[PDB]
């Protein structure tokens, strides 16, 4: 069930991320992570750790936001797995 919790929290990091990311990126010349929408696309593929590179942070706080988003993705992922694992182990104890 904490995996469920993980999903909620993630979706929140996915939004706060998109936000901060644009907030952090504007002002730094050449930055492309400056509009709310694609920002969100950016966070989604960075969380899924797929990161095509069509968009990437260039500032320090932008990268920090980045790191956090990465970890919410790499964690939820693991937590859903760790969950699944347990379910099958219990199911199997029969």
């Amino acid at each position, epitope marked *: 069930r904490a995996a469920g919790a993980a999903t909620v929290l993630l979706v929140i990091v996915l939004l706060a991320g998109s936000y901060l990311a644009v907030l952090a*990126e*504007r002002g730094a*010349p050449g930055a*492309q992570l400056i*509009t709310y929408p694609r920002a969100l696309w950016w966070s989604v593929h960075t969380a899924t750790t797929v990161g095509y590179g069509d968009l990437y942070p260039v500032t320090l706080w932008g990268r920090c936001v980045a790191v956090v988003v990465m970890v919410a993705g790499i964690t939820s992922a693991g937590l859903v797995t760790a969950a699944l694992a347990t379910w099958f182990v219990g199911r199997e104890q029969e």
Partner: antibody
Amino acid sequence: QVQLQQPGAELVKPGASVKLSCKASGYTFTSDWIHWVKQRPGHGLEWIGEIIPSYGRANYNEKIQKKATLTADKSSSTAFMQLSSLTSEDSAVYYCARERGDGYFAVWGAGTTVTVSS
Amino acid sequence: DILLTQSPAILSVSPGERVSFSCRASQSIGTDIHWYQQRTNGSPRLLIKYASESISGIPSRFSGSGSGTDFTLSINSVESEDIANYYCQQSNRWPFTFGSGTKLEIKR
């Protein structure tokens, strides 16, 4: 309805500093960015700076000599630009537009004619 | 910072004719180009957004086109009211930037 309301004009003595206003109404959002474009008579539009009211962060145009300082009054929904120590060169029409965070300037203001003279 | 070049500065066209203004980015900016129209003593007015998307309130006469570095604003059948100044502006890379503008003149 006329969303961005800007004072028709301001006269300013060389060296002095004016504080232009822009009071918005209509659909406001936390993702809202208020911009400032300066158009010298007979010339093109020139980005001056931008500000995100729901946070107060402000960035300016790095090529032009900074002669402005953006601020936003959370409650009264008004954006203020502080153009200090002016000169004939600063004399122009200043607009303020609202940007939803998607890149384009949806709506602009009427513009505040500023004339720097004695 | 991206440089939007707008040539020519003036366009002389006959009524009801089809006119096209071009904006060229110093580098690829996708479709993140937007066009504003400003008349004599008027403010800018969003015409097209994202190179080719409609804005409620703008004649269907106006259309957008292009991607990457070359974009084209277009008016199918010019008309007295369309006399103004046309500027393009990108929002691909910070800071946003404008074009030099293009004056449209009709030939009555």
